[PDB]
Design a protein around this ligand. Structure first.
Ligand SMILES: N#Cc1c(C2CCCC2)[nH]c2c(I)cccc12
Length: 347
C-alpha cells in the first residue's frame, strides 16, 4: 500500500539484493541508513565500476532537501581546485520508482568504524593529525567565497576513508548543508557535535563546522565523544563542564539562553538553578581538557604512555588547537586558513 509495494512504512525503498535497475545498476546490498533514506552498494555496468547509491526517502520534505544537496555537490565538484577532492564526488542523479537517487563513488569505512575497530582505544595522535589537516583543508575549500558552504552535520559517520588501509578521507552527506545567508533550520547538527550558537538559537555561520571538527578530533584520539549530551540541556551542561559558562556578550544575545542559564542582577550569567540537593555536573570549567587528553599523564587514560609521537609537547599543541576550535565566540573561533598554520601541523 506504500508506493505500489516498493516502499516500507518509513518512506524507504525496500532494498532487494541483486535487483537490476534501468539495465545499468546491479544492487548488491544495503550499506548504510540515515534520516535521509538509504545508501546501497551497486555495480554500474555502463561505466564498469562499483558505486554507492543514496536512495532518498519518497517524501516531499526529504526529496526537496536532497535537491539542495544535489545543487551544493555539483557546485563543489565543478570547482577548479585540488581542494575539491576532500568532498565526495556526485557522479549523476536520477529518479527511480519515485525516489531521488544520487550516485557517488564507492568509499570505505567511516571514522566511527575506525574507532570501533580499535575497541574505542582511539587512533594515534599522528593519525588524528592527518585527519585534522585534511578536514581543515576541506573546511578551507567550503569557506571559499563563491561556495560559503556550511556542512551542518559533521560527525565521525560522515567522514569516510577512501581505502580501508590508507588515511585519505572524504566528507559525505551534504543533506543538511546550506550556504551562508541561506540558512533554513534552527535544529541542526548531530547533538554531540552541536555548536553553542545552535543550542542557543542564535544565527550561525561556517564556524559551527569548526566546532564539530574540534569535537570530532578529541573523540578520534580518546575513543569517546567529548560532549555526550542526552538532550540539549544535558549537552550544554557538558560543554560548560569543560569550557565554563559562556561569555555574557554571547548569552545577552542568545534567544534560548534561559533554557540553560540565568542572568543575575549584576548582569553576569550562571547555570539555571537545579532542584533540591541534586548534584549532577562538574562545576563550570573543572573538567579540564588537559586531563581528558592526558597531556602530562601518558595520553587519554594513560594508554599512550611511552609511545613515540605522543610527547607532552605534542599534546600541548593538540590541546591549544582544540581550544581554539572550541572557542565560544564564533567570530574569534579559529578559521580554516589559520588552523592549518598551527604548530600542531608543523613537521
Ligand atoms: N550521504 C552519504 C553517504 C553515506 C551515508 C553516511 C551515513 C549513512 C551512509 N555513505 C556513503 C558512501 I559508502 C559513499 C558516498 C556517500 C555516502
Amino acid at each position: 500500500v506504500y508506493n505500489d509495494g516498493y516502499d516500507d512504512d518509513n518512506y524507504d525503498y525496500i532494498v532487494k539484493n541483486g535487483e537490476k535497475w534501468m539495465d545499468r545498476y546491479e544492487i548488491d546490498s544495503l550499506i548504510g541508513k540515515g534520516s535521509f533514506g538509504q545508501v546501497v552498494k551497486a555495480y554500474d555496468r555502463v561505466e564498469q565500476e562499483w558505486v554507492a547509491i543514496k536512495i532518498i526517502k519518497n517524501k516531499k520534505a526529504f526529496l526537496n532537501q536532497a535537491q539542495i544537496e544535489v545543487r551544493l555537490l555539483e557546485l563543489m565538484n565543478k570547482h577548479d581546485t585540488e581542494m575539491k577532492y576532500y568532498i565526495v564526488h556526485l557522479k549523476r542523479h536520477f529518479m527511480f520508482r519515485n525516489h531521488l537517487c544520487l550516485v557517488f563513488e564507492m568509499l570505505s569505512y567511516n571514522l566511527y568504524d575506525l574507532l570501533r575497530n580499535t575497541n574505542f582505544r582511539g587512533v594515534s595522535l599522528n593519525l588524528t593529525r592527518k585527519f585534522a589537516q585534511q578536514m581543515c583543508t576541506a573546511l578551507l575549500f567550503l569557506a571559499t567565497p563563491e561556495l560559503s558552504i556550511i556542512h551542518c552535520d559533521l560527525k565521525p559517520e560522515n567522514i569516510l576513508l577512501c581505502n580501508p588501509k590508507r588515511s585519505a578521507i572524504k566528507i559525505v552527506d551534504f543533506g543538511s548543508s546550506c550556504q551562508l545567508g541561506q540558512r533554513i533550520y534552527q535544529y541542526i547538527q548531530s547533538r554531540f557535535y552541536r555548536s553553542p550558537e545552535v543550542l542557543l538559537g542564535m544565527p550561525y555561520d561556517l564556524a559551527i563546522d569548526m566546532w564539530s571538527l574540534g569535537c570530532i578530533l578529541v573523540e578520534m584520539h580518546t575513543g569517546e565523544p567529548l560532549f555526550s549530551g542526552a538532550n540539549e540541556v544535558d549537552q550544554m551542561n557538558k560543554i560548560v563542564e569543560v569550557l565554563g559558562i559562556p561569555p555574557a556578550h554571547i548569552l545577552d544575545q542568545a534567544p534560548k539562553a534561559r533554557k540553560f542559564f540565568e542572568k543575575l542582577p549584576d548582569g553576569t550569567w550562571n547555570l539555571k538553578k537545579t532542584k533540591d540537593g541534586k548534584r549532577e555536573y562538574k562545576p563550570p570549567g573543572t573538567r579540564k581538557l588537559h586531563n581528558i587528553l592526558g597531556v602530562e599523564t601518558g595520553g587519554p587514560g594513560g594508554r599512550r604512555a611511552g609511545e613515540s609521537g605522543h610527547t607532552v609537547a605534542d599534546y600541548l599543541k593538540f590541546k591549544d588547537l582544540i581550544l581554539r576550535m572550541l572557542d565560544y565566540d564564533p567570530k574569534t573561533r579559529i578559521q580554516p586558513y589559520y588552523a592549518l598554520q598551527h604548530s600542531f601541523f608543523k613537521k
